[PDB]
Amino acid sequence: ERITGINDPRLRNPSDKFIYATVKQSSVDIYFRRQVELSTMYRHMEKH
Amino acid sequence: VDLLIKLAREMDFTYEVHLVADGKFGTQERVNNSNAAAWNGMMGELLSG
């Protein structure tokens, strides 16, 4: 399916079609902003 | 709320409850100051007394 787990091509590569996001200024935000691996995901979420 | 009420039942302490002002859980940041950073949110409410 669309999400095969925490690690998925749709999740790993933020296509313009599939938009994933989270709540800014929260523990999730701190968690994604903490790791450099998740920095791409943070760049994808930051706008949405 | 039920957990807090049950805690107030087990432990004799009463409770005054209120919602946080910013509406966020907690974070550490400084808007206008590069020198020092401060907590905001319920965490900030806890550290501010």
Add this chain to the structure above:
Amino acid sequence: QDFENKVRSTIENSFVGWELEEVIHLDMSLDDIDSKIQNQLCKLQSPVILL
């Protein structure tokens, strides 16, 4: 203090993978005999050092 706190301030909000391994303060108010400067500086690892 302003320098260190500034580097840490800017590096705090950086989304980049920034890492600073050590901050070493050498005391020049006293003459170097025990070679505490030597001992403190030899422990250094990182490729870039802000002096």
